Structure formats: structure tokens, C-alpha cells
Write a protein that binds this ligand. Structure first.
Ligand SMILES: [Zn+2]
Ligand SMILES: [Zn+2]
Lengths: 120, 120
RNA sequence: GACGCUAGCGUC
RNA sequence: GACGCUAGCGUC
């Protein structure tokens, strides 16, 4: 069932599992312009290249006074997208409100939709 | 089902699960004189007391050119005993030869006989 | 980011 | 030892 991700630090809404996409069964990104508003970016202090994408920026919660580290932003194929680490969020079940703290995506089981270039 | 612990680094036989005893359902020690031949000690650089015992020393694989860290030696009640961390070892099934690498005792499921002072 | 590794610190 | 938290390094 649908879930939302909240910033672990300030509990601000980040996105919904419906917006989440999986790349190479290993990396997690989020679609839509709404999410772009929820984080700010910063040139990565240790940028580098690996696999199918290059690491350009660190990303953080947009909430001033929070600035919680949410992960990175990368160039993947012809796209520049955010890649997030679940450890930076609280997962909340929308129907019940039950909150879950994961450390690894491997432990978080949901409909893991694979990334599709045709979604932009 | 009885199994043997091998030094993770040099693969030397250390003990059997038969010899293992649990203290406070959290800490693991080894009975018998045979095990006493398999490790050497060195005063603990960062001693301290906690729970029911006192940390006196570190213990290492007695094999020279190995000396893999196996855990500690403590005064517990009126006992001087070794306390081992499972991640310093490789578990081997005696019947099949299958080897398992655990990191935490909670993950290792064997007949965990609790410590009995009546056994020295 | 995913994973692996070293060092240090902290609690019982 | 059982947990917990930092920092750095490496790999793709
Ligand atoms: Zn936040
Ligand atoms: Zn050894």
C-alpha cells in the first residue's frame, strides 16, 4: 500500500513511494517537480564516476534549520536526477500512520517500480 | 547439532559449539583446557567494568603469524574466562563441511547452553 | 548512491 | 564482549 517518506530529522514530507523508481535494482530516485522543491543541492565535495552515472551533487532537506543529508544528485544517461538513501527518512503508512525506520533499501519492501526513461 | 569454530584468519580449529556457554544471554565463553592452548592474552589497553564482569585482557589466535583478535578475557564473579566474538571465527558443519560467516551471535542459531558455575 | 574497510568515541 | 555513534579510505 501507498507510503510517504518524511525527513528523518524535521519530519517534513519528502515524497510518496508511488513516485519512487529503482535503477539497476540498487539505486533509488524520485519523479515529479514537487520533490525538486523539497531539497536543495550542492556541488559534491568528492565527486566521482561509477556504474552508469556520475556523482555531481550532495542533496539536503530544503527546510532551513534542517538541511538533513538526503543523498546525492547524478547524471544518469541523458538525465540529472536525485538518488536518495532511505536511512534519511521515516516511512509512514498512509492508511494507519505507522512509521518505520529503515537503514537499508534491501529491508524496505514495497512495489519497487524500475526506472523508465519514457517517464522523463 | 554440534559444529566447530575455526579462526577466521588462519582457519585453525578453536573449539566446538558443545564447549560454548552463554552468560546473561549475551556473552559467550568456552569451557575446557584444550581451548586454553589455542589463544594467547595481552593486557587490555582500554579496560573497564560492566554488567557482572571486569575486562582484564584481549585474547588472540595463538598461531604465530596470525594472532587474530578473538575477543577478551574477564573476571566474572570468581572466574577468569575468555569471552569471544563470533565474527572472529568461521563456523563449520562437521557432517557437510559447510562454512558460515556470522557477524553477530543473535544470527547464529545453535543450542545455546547457559553458563553453569558448577562446570568451573 | 550501493557495498566493503580502517581508526576513534560513547552506553551497560 | 554486547550494542550505539562519528571520521576517513577503498571498490563499482
Ligand atoms: Zn528535514
Ligand atoms: Zn588464527
Amino acid at each position: 500500500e501507498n507510503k510517504k517518506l518524511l525527513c528523518r530529522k524535521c519530519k517534513a514530507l519528502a515524497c510518496y513511494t508511488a513516485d519512487v523508481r529503482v535503477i539497476e535494482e540498487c539505486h533509488y530516485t524520485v519523479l515529479g517537480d514537487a520533490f525538486k522543491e523539497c531539497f536543495v543541492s550542492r556541488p559534491h565535495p568528492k565527486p566521482k564516476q561509477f556504474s552508469s552515472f556520475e556523482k555531481r551533487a550532495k542533496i539536503f532537506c530544503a527546510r532551513q534549520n534542517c538541511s538533513h543529508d538526503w543523498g546525492i544528485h547524478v547524471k544518469y544517461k541523458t538525465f540529472e536526477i536525485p538518488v536518495i538513501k532511505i536511512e534519511s527518512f521515516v516511512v509512514e503508512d498512509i492508511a494507519t500512520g505507522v512509521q518505520t525506520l529503515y537503514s537499508k533499501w534491501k529491508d524496505f519492501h514495497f512495489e519497487k517500480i524500475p526506472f523508465d526513461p519514457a517517464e522523463m
